[PDB]
């Protein structure tokens, strides 16, 4: 699908012959993913008071 | 419905090698096989083919056999090694349009909707292209039996491919009339094209031979086109077409005069570039 290789997208290559094998979606580096969903803190508006 | 076809040298040789590999039959055999390929943008394409096991006898010549086990298994193999590749139609070796080639297409029309045929040549000599392709219609006129399954020749050409041109141009090494200058058009269509008009000229002369002697259908659907030709014959030398011609050309030879006029100045400048080269070489070198 050579119509789908946009200027800007992220793709995979070959090591030896150096050809394009597969288009890929966008990625999210480790730092962010471990910024996303690591709070199991379940405090509520009931606990806070005064403001 | 389908505009034109594209034929590769791989299938083109790939009939002929089969004609060799049954060529030990000696007596009589036609090569019949299955044509494979795609078609896109209403442009027919042909990529691959093979041949079916096939025999025929002249006594009671309405009997034919296509091994559908060989057909299903080998096309299943070809689908497996290439899912992009698929069926496109068929071909027979086609010297002179054999009789079973009216319902071979009906035998295998359940595979391809526009199950197209290809007629080729095994003794190649002509002044044209020895590749033919018809298309099935069962068109209805307005007299006699209507629905008549008549094949109709769609135009044909040999298609190239960037992969196969390496092998084609490698297998030529023989003659190549490149440096297409003022000469290559003169021979690719001005010498040869008049002979292209010669055969189509002679063809209606050969059909014309029924004057009181030949076959039984007289004219009906042949002479409206011929009468249309003789009506469509062009204008004679009376008008401005002469003065527009004369007028036309007269403009073109101006540009010819300018171009030839500059060419001589170019070569003269090269002569000065030569003089400077040899003179300042004689006294310096010695």
């Amino acid at each position: 699908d050579k119509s789908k290789l946009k200027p800007g997208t992220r793709v995979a290559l070959d090591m030896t012959t150096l050809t394009i094998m597969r288009y890929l979606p966008r990625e999210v580096d480790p730092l962010v993913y471990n910024m996303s969903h690591e709070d199991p803190g379940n405090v509520s508006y009931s606990e806070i008071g005064g403001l | 419905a389908v505009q034109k076809v594209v034929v590769h040298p791989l299938v083109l040789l790939s009939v002929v090698d089969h004609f060799n590999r049954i060529g030990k039959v000696g007596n009589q055999k036609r090569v019949v096989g299955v044509l494979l390929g795609s078609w896109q943008k209403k442009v027919l394409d042909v990529s691959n083919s093979f041949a079916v096991p096939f025999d025929e006898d002249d006594k009671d010549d309405s009997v034919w056999f296509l091994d559908h086990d060989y057909l299903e298994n080998m096309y299943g193999m070809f689908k497996k090694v290439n899912a992009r590749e698929r069926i496109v139609g068929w071909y027979h070796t086609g010297p002179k349009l054999h009789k079973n080639d009216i319902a071979i297409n009906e035998l295998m029309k359940r595979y391809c909707p526009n199950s197209v045929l290809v007629i080729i040549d095994v003794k190649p000599k002509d002044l044209g292209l020895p590749t033919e392709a018809y298309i099935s219609v069962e068109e209805v006129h307005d007299d006699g039996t209507p629905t008549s399954k008549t094949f109709e020749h769609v135009t044909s050409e040999i298609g190239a491919e960037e992969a196969e041109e390496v092998g084609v141009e490698h297998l030529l090494r023989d003659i190549k009339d490149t440096t297409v200058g003022t000469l290559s058009q003169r021979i690719t269509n001005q010498v040869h094209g008049l002979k292209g008009l010669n055969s189509k000229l002679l063809d209606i002369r050969s059909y014309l031979e029924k004057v009181a002697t030949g076959k039984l259908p007289i004219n009906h659907q042949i002479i409206y086109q011929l009468q249309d030709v003789f009506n469509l014959l062009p204008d004679v030398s009376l008008q401005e077409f002469v003065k527009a011609f004369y007028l036309k050309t007269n403009d073109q030879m101006v540009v010819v005069y300018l171009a030839s006029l500059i060419r001589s100045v170019v070569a003269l400048h090269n002569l000065i570039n030569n003089k400077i080269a040899n003179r300042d070489a004689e006294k310096k070198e010695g």
Partner: protein
């Protein structure tokens, strides 16, 4: 023994099979089978090649299914004519040609079947017209390399005619396999029917080529040909000056009027004369 004068004959069709199937799945090392008559101790004549579909994704050579080649071997048996498997191939795509360690294994599985099996590498990128590049190979015994003994006993000035590539020389080249000089078999029965059919116009030069825009295009060249000739009235005048080698290196940033001029003179010339003569024949031929 052999005399490095083996001289493989092949075909006129199998080259097309090798480039097509080697080209369609080109970044993966595709493969298939070779199929021809095995003539005498020196030569071999491999007339046909059918390919094999892959096993899975991955750049390698997969495997061989004797169910599949057992059936496909019999399809032509009950349809065309019997042949014999002689060799096999794979495809170093844009590499050149040698034997990998994976290649030498599946070769080694085949030489035990028939001692004169043939390894073949196609390279469907670095070929353009005269350079097809195949260079069929076969293993040599490393046992004799342990013996320190020279095999293959040249009796003919036929082997050392092509110099080996430096990359295959880096690879197993002369320590595990040898090259074979090959050529091709062809006939005028094929030569005519591929020559006479590849590039053929039909009745196209018997046309008039956009009769309004012919003179318009003629204008559309002459107009900038004027200013290009003004540049030719610019570029001559720095002669009787600095040396023409400096008038060679110095002209790699800006265009010259000379070559660019004599291009357009040719284009206008052959553009006009064809339309003139082809315009004038139809006056005679058509009424």
């Amino acid at each position: 023994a052999v005399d490095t004068a083996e001289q493989v004959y092949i075909s006129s069709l199998a080259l097309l099979k090798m480039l097509k199937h080697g080209r369609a799945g080109v970044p993966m090392e595709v493969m298939g089978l070779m199929l021809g008559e095995f003539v005498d101790d020196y030569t071999v004549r491999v007339i046909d090649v059918f390919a094999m579909p892959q096993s899975g994704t991955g750049v390698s050579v997969e495997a061989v299914d004797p169910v599949f080649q057992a059936k496909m071997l019999d399809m032509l048996k009950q349809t065309g004519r019997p042949e014999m498997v002689v060799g096999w191939y794979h495809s170093h795509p844009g590499f050149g040609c040698w034997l990998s360690g994976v290649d030498i294994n599946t070769q080694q599985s085949f030489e035990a079947l028939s001692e004169r099996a043939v390894a073949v590498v196609v390279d469907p990128i670095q070929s353009v017209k005269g350079k097809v590049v195949i260079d069929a190979f076969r293993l040599i015994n490393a046992n004799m390399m342990v013996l320190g003994h020279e095999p293959r006993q040249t009796t003919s000035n036929l082997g050392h005619l092509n110099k080996p590539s430096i990359q295959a020389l880096i690879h197993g080249l002369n320590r595990h396999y040898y090259s074979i000089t090959i050529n091709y078999r062809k006939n005028e029965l094929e030569q005519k029917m591929l020559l006479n059919l590849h590039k053929k116009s039909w009745m196209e030069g018997l046309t008039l080529q956009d009769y309004s825009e012919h003179c318009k295009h003629n204008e559309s060249v002459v107009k900038e040909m004027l200013e290009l000739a003004k540049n030719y009235n610019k570029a001559v005048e720095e002669e009787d000056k600095m040396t023409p080698e400096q008038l060679a290196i110095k002209n790699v940033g800006k265009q010259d009027p000379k070559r660019h001029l004599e291009e357009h003179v040719d284009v206008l010339m052959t553009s006009n004369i064809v339309q003139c003569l082809a315009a004038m024949l139809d006056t005679v031929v058509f009424k």
